[PDB]
Symmetry: C2
Subunit: 371 residues, 2 copies
Amino acid sequence: DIDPNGLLEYSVVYTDRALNHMSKAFQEVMNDLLSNLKTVYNAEAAVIIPGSGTYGMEAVARQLTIDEDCLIIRNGWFSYRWTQILEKGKFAKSSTVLTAERTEDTEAPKPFAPVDIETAVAKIKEDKSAIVYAPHVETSSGIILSEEYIKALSEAVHSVGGLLVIDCIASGCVWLDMKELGIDVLISAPQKGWSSTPCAGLVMLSAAAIKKVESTESNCFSLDLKQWLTIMRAYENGGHAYHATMPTDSLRQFRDAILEAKEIGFDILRDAQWELGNRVRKVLTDKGIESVAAEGFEAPGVVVSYTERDDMHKGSAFAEAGLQIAAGVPLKVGEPDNFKTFRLGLFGLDKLTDIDGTVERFEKALDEVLA
Amino acid sequence: DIDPNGLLEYSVVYTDRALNHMSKAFQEVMNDLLSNLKTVYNAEAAVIIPGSGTYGMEAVARQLTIDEDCLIIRNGWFSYRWTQILEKGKFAKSSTVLTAERTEDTEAPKPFAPVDIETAVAKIKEDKSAIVYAPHVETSSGIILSEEYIKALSEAVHSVGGLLVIDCIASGCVWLDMKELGIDVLISAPQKGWSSTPCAGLVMLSAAAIKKVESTESNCFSLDLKQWLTIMRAYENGGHAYHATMPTDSLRQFRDAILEAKEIGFDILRDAQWELGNRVRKVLTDKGIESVAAEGFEAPGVVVSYTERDDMHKGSAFAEAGLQIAAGVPLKVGEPDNFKTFRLGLFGLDKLTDIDGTVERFEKALDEVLA
């Protein structure tokens, strides 16, 4: 079942129930993962860090921000996460946080937009930021940064000798080409857009990023980004290496999910992601439910809306109608005290290959909730 | 296939291909994992940290050693790992390393024993160690610490107000009862003895350990042991919580492996582990191949032997005979320059329920290698 053409398992790292990282079968998995990930994101290297997306975030911070000044575009809870990483660690020299702003300050609920690009750009040059962190899609607010916004951040941080880190964990199938946009570190995970089991943080790197990872030293043995890149390279060179045990069978499932997506069509999936998001957003606005993300910054894979109902906000009402949603969470952007929301994720090959059904099932549920 | 009685997936954390951590099905998985792990090890709490055994080691160190003096019983590479964690981090006040010693200093190869218990005990009291780290089974040397040795370390560190941390990642089915031995933190993983896929570090805790985790503050957001204990408690209280995404489907496989073991019999498996290890060790000594672990400290789940053959030492000769072994690695204990070894792992339900076959298949291979 597991490694049928392989060797009898007498290593100190596995039993016959798990795929051995030294097997020919896992070597092929790693080579398929690394090549496909580089191609999709246009990256020079792809690093797989056991754990989750957060651990990838932490590996990147700990490798590249030791005694550095950084700037963070905070659009909600998961870009606040950069602050939580840096505050617990106390390893960075400094941190500038540019928070999202409401489009108007009234009692009634107003959507949020990221800090305007001119101000972000100016501040990065004033700061001489070694590293800039920004979420492509912020999961708490449904805010998506445009390709041109990201590019502007890239050029600004490059002009002062720094690198751009983009968190694409909630991007879904909205693929970013790193060289076109000038992104140096791109972070993903297998469980949202890629439709597999959770197991690892994914860190893709540009040439400039690889160069800086090689000339820096991490302060965390387990999450050492340079050491995990060394492991990746042993597989790229036709062999294997060990630092800490990799989630081998879960990574093989991820490789299969990548190829399933590939056979469908990455561009078809990109357009599908947008179609679904727009159609779901329309259903909500049609029922008078307003978006927490301002016009022009509305993410397709995550839709966050305002509510005044606790059973909508905590998700219980949708659960009664047979749907699992995500409870609203704070933004940590100075949002008002009455801030109350609910969240929907529209990730996955099965949703994207049946857009009509995914919308219809959401509609019936929303109708039952509002009835 | 995945959560057939559950809700339609519209959360921001999963697709329909993975088990949602908020589902009733995963709640039951967590409750089975936590109760069975506490029972097996006689622990007050069980914490599951996404990643691997190493990450559990790191979470423990980062929670409990900030500005503390610690003592480490170094028996090989994986207890050197404690030093590697502390050196990269630079968060501990101090570290005393007591390395294993050869039974005699001759040109020919001699086995290794841990530092004698009287000296370990004396040093801990001199040091006033806040934390003592020791490997139950050291994977590089095949050295196993006796239950009475561990107990001695416990009493010594308790007498000066500290806690005992035992790494049981290579213990196999040689179960340790924490209250009997006075162990405060016991670290495991699902992929060696427990016969599942890799995905997480397992940290079991005594009452005194829980009390110290609650009154300390970690320096690493992702591996914060107190924060992962808080997550465990939400499941124990009948709900769920999120810090970073858990490897949900892999943990369900682990729960199933725990129950498979349970149905066979944990004591039957303990005796089986010893039978296999002793029988495999006998086959080696019968062919003149000597053990790297000294008499009385020979581990059953990991057998490390001396060789002068590079094809035995790197494992290629066993691979020719159809077996995957582990290449010999250094100890970092001041071993001689000519130190050359090879390693066998005897982990797993399938080996332990067919001891005759596991020995016989190893014998045929060893015979082919030596022919």
